Subunit: 450 residues, 3 copies
Amino acid sequence: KALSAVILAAGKGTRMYSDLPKVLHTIAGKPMVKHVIDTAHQLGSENIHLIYGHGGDLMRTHLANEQVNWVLQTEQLGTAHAVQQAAPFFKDNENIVVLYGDAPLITKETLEKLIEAKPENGIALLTVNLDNPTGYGRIIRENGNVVAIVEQKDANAEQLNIKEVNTGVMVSDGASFKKWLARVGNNNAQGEYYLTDLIALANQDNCQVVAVQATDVMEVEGANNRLQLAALERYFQNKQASKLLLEGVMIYDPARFDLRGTLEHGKDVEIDVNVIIEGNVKLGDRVKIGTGCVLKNVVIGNDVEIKPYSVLEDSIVGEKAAIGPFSRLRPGAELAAETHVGNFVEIKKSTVGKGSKVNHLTYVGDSEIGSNCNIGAGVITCNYDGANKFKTIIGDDVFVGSDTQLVAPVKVANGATIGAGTTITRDVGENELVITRVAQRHIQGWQRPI
Amino acid sequence: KALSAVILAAGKGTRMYSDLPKVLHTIAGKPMVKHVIDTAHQLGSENIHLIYGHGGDLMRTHLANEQVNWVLQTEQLGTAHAVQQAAPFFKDNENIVVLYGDAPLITKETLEKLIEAKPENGIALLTVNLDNPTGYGRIIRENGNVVAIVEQKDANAEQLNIKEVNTGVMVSDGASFKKWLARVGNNNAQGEYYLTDLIALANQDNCQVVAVQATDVMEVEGANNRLQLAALERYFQNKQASKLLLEGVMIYDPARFDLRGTLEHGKDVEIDVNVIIEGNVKLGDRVKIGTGCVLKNVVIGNDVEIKPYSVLEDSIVGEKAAIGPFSRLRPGAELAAETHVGNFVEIKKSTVGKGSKVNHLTYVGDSEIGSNCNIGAGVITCNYDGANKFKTIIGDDVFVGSDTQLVAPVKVANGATIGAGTTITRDVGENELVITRVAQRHIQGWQRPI
Amino acid sequence: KALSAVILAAGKGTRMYSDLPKVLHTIAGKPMVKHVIDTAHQLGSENIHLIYGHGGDLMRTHLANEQVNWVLQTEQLGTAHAVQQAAPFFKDNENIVVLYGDAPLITKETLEKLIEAKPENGIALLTVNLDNPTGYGRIIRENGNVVAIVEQKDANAEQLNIKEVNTGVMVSDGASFKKWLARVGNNNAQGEYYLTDLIALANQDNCQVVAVQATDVMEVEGANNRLQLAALERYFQNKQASKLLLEGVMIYDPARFDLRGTLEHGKDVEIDVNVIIEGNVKLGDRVKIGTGCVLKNVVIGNDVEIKPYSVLEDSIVGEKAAIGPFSRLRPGAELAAETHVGNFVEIKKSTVGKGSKVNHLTYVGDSEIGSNCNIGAGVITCNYDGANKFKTIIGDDVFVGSDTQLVAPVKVANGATIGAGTTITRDVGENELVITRVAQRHIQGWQRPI
Ligand SMILES: [Co+2]
Ligand SMILES: [Co+2]
């Protein structure tokens, strides 16, 4: 049968001490609630009902492109009330899974087991075994079904020793949700309508509640503050790193690796300590990334070595290229195969052709550079003090001498040679050598301090 | 009643294999003994008696400004002898707490509980529960008082199973200390006068000894070598990071964060992995610090982003500024609001006005730069080969073309424009455009190798 | 008696998902098998028989200089078959230790205990206690000898509770190995000749098998995939860091320190977080290394401070020098005592004399620089567009003004002074001042946008 999800995401998250609402805080570069939405989607959810409230405008701007039903809750009166806000949209004969936007680590695999265990007209309840279950509702099993969830202060001596507890995550059909939610009351110390009470109501109707245990405790773990969030981050990063290691990526230290997006990789990739991968990154076979590198939205070809402390964004690098150390590629940098970019070099919105080298203390911006060029140390592309900036076009087999300024717009044709210390404002023709004629004064017998 | 402290700090620390004495080795940038002095002061200590000996000259130079009574011990004959060196200065009716300079993690909160538990004319003894208490003196409690501290080799079978042990940290009134210290002997295998024996002497006088358990084991942990010191460092850094997380600072990985001083922060601050905060640092609301940054003695305004691998010291940065990546601010750097400092840029002892940008491969030193200036790539402030160095003064709305040298002392007035590749030695007037007239030789048909 | 080793190293290592064979994957910069070879050599092995097969050509190129007997196995038929490939070369009256090339952490100390415990005409078997020994052969001890190794599916209830298990590492005399290996069969579910069966065969001959327990579990741990390899790496790095800490090296965080080679150190060395030491590195007394540094094959003198994010290779640095931050020393960099190298500076194959400074945005390559020189910001050594590159020779007490290009081959004699913005192509004489005569056009009333 079909499936839809409800995600509870209305909380202020006071103990985050933030202007953001609770579920917008990020794990691996992505809001907690976005993790849950994505999981619901890969589970096969037809509709995803997002219960939101606090920080509503921020939720709407930060999640504008998410395919969810925006259910704006005016007041928080308990989890049953929150789920009931979406209840009018439940199809009678689809399953509904209830998830929490501040519990981002829940896996598709666990939720698939949960849905499959759900008996007809009944509930599947996600539980978890804790070593210290103090404070949480204990799962009472008579034969093989959950007959009760006994809270801390109601439990007798032997019931407090039960380690299995309620997570609040559950699956039931839409018609059953509509029926039981309307029968939840608020006669308790908190004065709230608890979704937990559906287990009691199901047992009242002689409907079966089956428990499905979560594999990992951290899977169902939420974050009420940033310390707890940091713990989820580290668990998540360790799981990601472990997956990549088993796929054949050499990560020198998985505790010093961060992925905040997606990584496609070839074979024999080596990633040294303290590397951050952000956005969508693709690495070819035998790519080596040195320590300290940051790669955001990049494609790197086979056999590329990126040396330490290089920062690359929105860039493409061809096979057998060598980058770094201390290299910076800014958006629009496109390096061809067998190129060389060296220390204290910045390349922005420029193409660099096969075999070309740019190895020291250089800025290349808004440029096209051909194949087998030699861009000397200290070379800078610049503009006049005008309005918009303009392009520098360098052909193939050009030598640009050290500490030369290329003043756009300008064109340097194939095979040209430019001396060191030159200011190029006029176009340079094919096989044209341009050298600066300097005037110097020479003073003999100039004694420096002694 | 009043309080004074005695800090034992005379040890050579042989297993540190150092020219420094034991207690000068740092935790979080601060000598171990300095942590203990500070804790004693915040506890409300009127006097702090520092028992020192080995590396005496180094102690005096490294702790010159500490408000302590310098008690120079000529020989180490045991802890009771060390405390007795300060005994003549004890007021009869003040409390005295004994602390160890190689145990820097002891908290004010635990010591407050210790002092409060001290019965009149008696002792409060700090104890700790260990899982393996082998080697340490076991606490024997008859009813609710410590009647004995039984060492390892004296204990019977059931006494060795006692987990509570002696830390050596204790509180008693000054008159009681004077009395009992004079009655400590050295008839034991080590031939030393042990402060531990005060518990036996108190029980001899029908005075009560009460045990107060330490909350954390690491709290009372000492360091005899650098491996143990590293363990204290990591515990300390984790506690600091956890405090900041609960206060609402997003620290991506608290295991890769170091604070060596103090941090004042606003809300929604984000600190990426491998950041070091040193000295006194203040961060405004919504400050983002990228990976690899080092901030020492800096003030950063609201909404500033510092991008990866930026190093800042003794600097101020105004609101909405953007720094990095690979930016270096040296002492005296003062950046106004909405400024931009980019990769491979070094700013030393200079003010930079609102909206100005210095984005590539540039050194600005001993300079004043006004508002809305454009400092081109490759610009360098420099001096003549003389004696002292001098200042470069740039006004508002000045354009400095790429790869220009500004030769101090020089003044560039408001609205001036300087072409790329210029050497500025003479003052530039208001709305003056200065462009370099280059001489070039152009040789056609210059064939590069083929 | 004499000793030789056999190292099993023929595996494909399929779950590494690599073009390399299993044992060539590195720990601490060194192939796993190289760790085992080195350990065998320091144990005093006369011969080391390397059983290899998969990735044979890669094994031969990567381990070309290793002093081993290359035993090429054509098919993997079990560990007994592998050891038997080397059996013809065993001396009858030498001991033989069998080691695994994918278990690199085995220590000389444990193997020395193993060899010493071996009874005449018998076997010494290395065992290990696991908390969960499921899947491994249990050690059965009748009195004080191993009478059997009972596999998982043969063991009765009480035998499964035995924690001591077989590692496969063993020592016996060469004649005994020749005898028993010829009697190993393959009648088991896998159809393989197991070295494990030697224990049964020894007991058949009324020869004693003695168990020697490994001290650390990780010591005998192998790596079948890169996740397991990463675990070995971290264990290894932690052991190395702990050794250095106990020797008196201050490592701020031993979990963020990597040694991939050897480190000789003096006293009072301080190494901040995220430092990588590669190849052979020697540090003098009181060397301080800042965060993020990479040192490969370097010698650093007493009292040198290397500031953050400096990368040094194949370089020598004299006493009291100051390097960094953001400094790069490339192979052949030789800095004398009391030198200064600063941010965004690259030095390649150059000598720099005592007291000289090169503090900003500079490339010095293929150069000799004398004592007490001042190399200004933006200075670049460069070449003509020719064939080979050439040398820049600068004498003592030379001032090179900012943004000057030195065009090799060129010589600047003692005491010379060069103005900023100069292009030096001709030799400069002793006490010669060279200043560039610039031509500038000055346009008054040039109004920039408003
Ligand atoms: Co220039
Ligand atoms: Co320049």
